């Protein structure tokens, strides 16, 4: 939908190197990227930014996922050996509901 971008992040480093905040039943109902660390996979990619809201991970919606579950989905997506990237559907819009 308008405002969303699919970003494929290569697993170029040993971590993703982002911090995320939010998840279901919080004021930030979909997770927001709050930091991008130098040296991590996300910094290397150049396509993810502080403020991006993550809508889907590898095609799985994060809507309805509590913060701990969303984070675990992303961690498991980074750890898997099935592929050498993670697909994030992100938006630059604020998401408030």
């Amino acid at each position: 939908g308008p405002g969303s971008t699919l970003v494929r992040v290569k697993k170029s480093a040993a971590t993703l190197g982002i911090a995320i905040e939010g998840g279901a039943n919080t004021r930030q109902p979909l997770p927001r990227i709050v930091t991008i660390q130098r040296g991590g996979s996300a910094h290397n990619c150049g396509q993810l930014k502080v403020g991006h809201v993550i809508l889907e991970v590898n095609g799985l919606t994060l809507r309805g996922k509590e913060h701990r579950e969303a984070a675990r989905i992303i961690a498991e997506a980074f750890k898997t050996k099935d592929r050498d990237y993670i697909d994030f559907l992100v938006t630059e819009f604020n998401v408030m509901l």
Binding site: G3, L48, K49, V50, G51, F93, N94, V95, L97
Partner: peptide
């Protein structure tokens, strides 16, 4: 430069 501006659009 990996930072978005405040957004002027919000999903409700």
């Amino acid at each position: 430069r990996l930072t978005l501006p405040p957004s002027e659009i919000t999903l409700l």
